[PDB]
C-alpha cells in the first residue's frame, strides 16, 4: 500500500539494504505533515454523509440525461449505487489522508476502474463531476485549515487525473 514508509522500505528491500539515514529522514516527513492530513481525515469522517449527498446531487444536476431510460441512472436503485460509489471514493480519500499516500485510492478505487466503468457503461464524467464539485466546494478556513485543505484537495485532484 503506497505510503512514505512502504516506499522507502520497498526500495531498501529491492537493493538488499538495511534502513539508512535517507529512509529515516523521509519518515521524519510523516511526523511533520501528519497533522494537516489527519485534520482533513477527521473532518471527512465526521461529515461524509453531507459531503456525499452534495456531490451526488451535483452529478445529477449537471447530467440530467442520466435519469433517462437505458442510461446509467435510469432508476432509483441505480441512482442509489451512484451515491454509494461517491461515498466509497470519499472513504478511500479518508484512508489516503490517514496513510499519507495514494495507496488506498490506487488499490481499491482506481485499479480496474476504467474497465469497470466502460463495461457497465458508467460515464467517467459523472464521477469527475462529483469529485470536482467536492474539490471546488471546499471552503478554507471555514471547513478546515489551509494545509488540511491542500492535502484533501491533492487526493481529489489525484483521483480526477486518474479518471482523465
Amino acid at each position: 500500500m503506497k505510503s512514505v514508509i512502504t516506499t522507502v522500505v520497498s526500495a531498501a528491500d529491492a537493493a538488499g539494504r538495511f534502513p539508512s539515514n535517507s529512509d529515516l529522514e523521509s519518515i521524519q516527513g510523516n511526523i511533520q505533515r501528519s497533522a494537516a492530513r489527519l485534520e482533513a481525515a477527521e473532518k471527512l469522517a465526521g461529515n461524509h454523509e453531507a459531503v456525499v449527498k452534495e456531490a451526488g446531487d451535483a452529478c445529477f444536476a449537471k447530467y440530467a440525461y442520466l435519469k433517462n431510460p437505458g442510461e446509467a441512472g435510469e432508476n432509483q436503485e441505480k441512482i442509489n449505487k451512484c451515491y454509494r460509489d461517491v461515498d466509497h471514493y470519499m472513504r478511500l480519500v479518508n484512508y489516503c489522508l490517514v496513510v499519507g499516500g495514494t495507496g488506498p485510492l490506487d488499490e481499491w478505487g482506481i485499479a480496474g476502474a476504467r474497465e469497470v466503468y466502460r463495461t457497465l457503461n458508467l460515464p467517467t464524467s459523472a464521477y469527475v463531476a462529483s469529485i470536482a464539485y467536492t474539490r471546488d466546494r471546499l471552503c478554507v478556513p471555514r471547513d478546515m485549515s489551509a494545509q488540511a485543505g491542500v492535502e484533501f484537495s491533492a487526493y481529489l485532484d489525484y483521483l480526477i487525473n486518474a479518471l482523465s
Partner: protein, 177 residues
Amino acid sequence: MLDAFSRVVVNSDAKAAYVGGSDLQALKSFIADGNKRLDAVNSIVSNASCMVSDAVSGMICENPGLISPGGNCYTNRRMAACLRDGEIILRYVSYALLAGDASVLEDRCLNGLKETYIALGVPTNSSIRAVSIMKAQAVAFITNTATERKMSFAAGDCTSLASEVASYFDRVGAAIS
C-alpha cells in the same frame, strides 16, 4: 506490505468505516513517539554486523556439532549462507520496526521459510537460537543497555519499542517451528 497506518485502514475497510478521531489516538501517538522509533531502528542498523556475527557464533559455541562434518554450518559455503540468513532476518525485522507492522517480515521473509529449511536440512531449532540471541541484542541496543556499546539519546522510556521488536523476532521462530 502494510505499515501501522495502513493496518488501521485495512481493518476499517473490512467494516466499510471511515477512520475518525476515536480511531486515531493510537496513530497520533505513533507519530508523537516517531523520533524514538527512528532512534530504535538506528540503534539496530548501526550494530547489525556485530549482531549477526555474535549471534551465529553464539549458536555454534553452544552447539559445536553444527561445525563437525555433516553439521549444517560445516564448510565456508555453509557458514557464509548461515551468516547470510542471519543478516536477512535482521533486515526484515528492522523493516517491521520501521513500519510498525509485521507484514513485510511475514510476507517477504517468513512465508515459505519453514518448507525451505525443511527441504535444505537447515536445523530450525538452531535457527531459533540464533534469532533469540539477536532478540537479546536488539532489546539491549534499543534501551541503550548493551554491555559493550552505548549510543547517544535524549533520555526517555523505550520499553514499548523493545517489546515490539521482540515480538517480531518471536514471529520468526513461530513461523519455522
